[PDB]
Amino acid sequence: NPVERYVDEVLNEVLVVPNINQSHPTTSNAAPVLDAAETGHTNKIQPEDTIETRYVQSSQTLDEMSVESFLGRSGCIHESVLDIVDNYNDQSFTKWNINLQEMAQIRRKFEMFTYARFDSEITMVPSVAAKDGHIGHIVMQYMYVPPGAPIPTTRDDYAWQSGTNASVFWQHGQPFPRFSLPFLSIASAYYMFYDGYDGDTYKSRYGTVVTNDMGTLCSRIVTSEQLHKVKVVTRIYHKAKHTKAWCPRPPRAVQYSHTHTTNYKLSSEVHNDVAIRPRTNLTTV
Amino acid sequence: NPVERYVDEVLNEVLVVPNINQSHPTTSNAAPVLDAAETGHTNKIQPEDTIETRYVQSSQTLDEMSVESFLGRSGCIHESVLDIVDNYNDQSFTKWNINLQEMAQIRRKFEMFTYARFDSEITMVPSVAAKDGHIGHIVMQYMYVPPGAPIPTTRDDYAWQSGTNASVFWQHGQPFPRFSLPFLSIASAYYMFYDGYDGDTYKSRYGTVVTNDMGTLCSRIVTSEQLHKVKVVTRIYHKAKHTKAWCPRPPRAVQYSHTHTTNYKLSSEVHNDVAIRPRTNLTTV
Amino acid sequence: GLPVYVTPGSGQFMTTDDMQSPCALPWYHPTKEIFIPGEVKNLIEMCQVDTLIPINSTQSNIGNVSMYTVTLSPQTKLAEEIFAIKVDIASHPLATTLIGEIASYFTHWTGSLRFSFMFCGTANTTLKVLLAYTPPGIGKPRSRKEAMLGTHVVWDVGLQSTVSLVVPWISASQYRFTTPDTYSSAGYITCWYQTNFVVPPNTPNTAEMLCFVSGCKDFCLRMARDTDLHKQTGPITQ
């Protein structure tokens, strides 16, 4: 019943964990505690098998541990800066090749899976710093340029007409802009990892750069040159919605160094490169 | 069922492409690959006719390729400038003879058809540049003046009373103004092209200027003269809604030079005038 | 128009909100979903899989596979201690195991833990070991006698190489903090020689043991948070 299911949603009790049943002393030739990890399987022994347990009714739920929940939180993926220093025409617009590889926080979460499929919610937080005192009337234009569409080379480029591309215009003082993007891949899922090349020569590119081209985000201050200079920083936040993920993997253990690659750097003292805190010895807790 | 149809809308699966069926080897005196282009028809041969295909279920849809979708995106058609330099009374108002011919991006899309009929959604994006520091309280008036109605000659002209004409008043800080316009032609469809004149003499006008008069858009800063000068640029965006189009045509291959005419200019090196990139020879891919 | 009352919170952007928003690409039809093996729907699926504990992560072993093995050998003194670690899911050396890493993305944890051990000596090497869990409210046991007064398993090495010790959920509160917290410290797990490591002649006099950890049917995490097991100290560039 969709209404009972509804109540479970409100209470967050869709996925309940099992109870612990009462167990008793045993003397048997069946030894559940013994197994063989060589098989590649995890021994499914439970507490009732090793100790005498009491009956306990569980009230914990796994709803919050769902993939939708784990990846369904909006995190920063880019900080766009438009700093008017000495040339308005050159400094009032910019572009960014879109990716989820530049901020470690969300990158690491998505990379705990090999493939992922989801729709995207993008929320933008623009902040106008009054470097000279006044901000005037700031109007921004954020244009999504799919691969192949002409990229504007000036603040008055004809490409800004946005005759076909999607553009979002924001006016200072109005609420933060937000829009959704359908799953954009030409494949059935996004590659979080890709052990492949775009060719078969020594100069072929390796990794997700080959498969993950999502276009460019071009920004521009629509307002013409003003007396007072401003520094507009637009932070882009991304949230995955309607998510599916496949083939889990070990979490990134070292710092990221570059986009689209698993490359890392190691110091002479490797213990400083990982989160593992050195133990004094085996018996010192 | 309007609900099943509804789901198709949400999923964008209203127009599905056909499947590929499995085919087999053939030895026949029926040769579908042979035909005669002289007839003016396209040979309807499909992949199953030339190779042995496997069965594949298609999941692609043509919804996004619909005329409604193609022309249903808001693009800039005009950039109105009110630059207060040294005379508020003269520089605080302006007018524009409305047309969809000044911006190449949307003009080219509409011109891929001979006739088109649609309602129009106009969205305006005004941006006030504080040339001297402060903007004060900017209130704008955009009046739609149909052909024949009196055009204001001063910022305080009685025509601004808008006793009958539609005027849109916008206050700085408030959301972008927007309104719809019904199909305005005196004909059944708009002429994208018109091989005709408004008379039969050597001085008769030729082309769409004869048929496409949509009036004038008159703008004015309602706010009286302020100490600090501003430059208000209002960008007009147009989107076609409830669209129908007839008789498709070749896309514009060269740059546009003027409104309402197919006139073009050619340099001494014509290959620079078209998008065709010169080939080295016939066998160099 | 309908009279409305704009409520506090309007216009704010909360990273955890759940609102609808217009689609920038109307009419767009996403690529057909194909079947891909290995779909994961809940992180609990990853917490139920055994991963190795870098139990021998002394400074000299870190950066070596040896940080994952415990060495056993013939003893001259009886009931000697082999190893001792805290049971706290996100404490070291449990922190970098898959379950420890996932636990670090949450604030609270509950449930029983399953610790497994695989003996890797020769087929002719014998051994009996006592694995014990000491509930909180007391220090780590200083002797085998002290340790066995708690929850324990006596492991006899034989045909089946692996044994499992379950650390039952024995807590005052229903949940404990994943971050080290005095009030919620879960106790200790120690390992002692029950008998001795015995081998026939011409057989290696030392052998390794691997240690695993995973969550039981009642393991559960709560209150999502950012992990402290990974950082970004600079820009990640192209």
Partner: peptide, 29 residues
Amino acid sequence: GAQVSRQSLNYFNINYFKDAASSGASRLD
């Protein structure tokens, strides 16, 4: 777009936009 249930405790699962990408977080299972 409205999924109206009844139990009375009526549920209204409204979808305000015409594209699936626009809806909020997915249900579970």
